[PDB]
Design a protein around this ligand. Sequence first.
Ligand code: G92
Length: 327
Amino acid sequence: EYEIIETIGNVVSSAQQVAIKKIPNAFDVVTNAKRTLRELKILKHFKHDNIIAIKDILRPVPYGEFKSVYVVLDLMESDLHQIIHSSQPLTLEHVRYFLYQLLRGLKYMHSAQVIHRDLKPSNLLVNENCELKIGDFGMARGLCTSEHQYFMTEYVATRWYRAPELMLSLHEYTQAIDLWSVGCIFGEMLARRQLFPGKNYVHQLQLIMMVLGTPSPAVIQAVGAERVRAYIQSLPQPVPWETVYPGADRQALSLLGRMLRFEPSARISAAAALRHPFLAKYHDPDDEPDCAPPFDFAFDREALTRERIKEAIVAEIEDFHARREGI
Ligand SMILES: COc1cc2ncnc(C3CCN(C(=O)c4ccc(OC(F)(F)F)cc4)CC3)c2cc1OC
């Protein structure tokens, strides 16, 4: 059926060209197997041009020897990290178009009660024809949660893009998490360099404070871990986005400012971001769908043995083929 050529990320390999992902020893570790089942069900639930899609899943040898899962996707030229940090063009109009598509993908995603929680340029794929697709859904969760990650929210996802609520454990974990990350991504496109490149937990809070200023007392009281509160209080106003990005566009910084706020409830939504004057060029409500029905994460909260999860994953592969080949 397919012929491999070269390995890309590490396992994904190039191979009509396609990308093929090996998930080796998929059923050997509970965490890895649970993540594979979550990704399967999320990607099958979504049908949207700005969200990665599975083209094919290679079938099962006898069942007991079924160890690895191969997943076929359409090959994407690059990702937004490789584009941002290179000699490629990235004018304001590039920034405007890439931001639109991310936000278009998020409106759909957020309407199904799914929070990505791991948006960074490297997870935003871009093909030869400039379609941007959100990938890598292993960190995604709903509004309700059961996991070590219930506590320890400061270890959720990637440090340079992590929202203050996770860092500080503010007990208000919503789709607003992704809009922080978008803010960082947006800022990073405008300057071609990371906005908040923290070295460790403490330096990451510094660098956010050096732009956003001191957080409010009501935010500080909602920090549960007392040791972090003491550090914040030991330090002696916001820096205007104009002086952070000197040559930048006016409409862009307005929108950026509505994303990078300490308080989750103060952040603009994906839907409302798409109504901002900066994205008027591309904004069409009739072409920017919601996702119905919503995604249920109940299956993830179940404490399953590796073998039950294996059975679950194999049923999602069977159902994938039945919905197209059979029916
Ligand atoms: C030249 O650059 C690249 C092109 C690329 N083209 C296409 N797809 C990729 C990767 C994107 C991220 N990704 C997933 O989101 C994903 C999808 C399905 C999965 O299976 C399961 F879990 F549902 F079972 C697991 C992971 C894996 C595929 C690509 C990755 C590239 O660089 C790293």
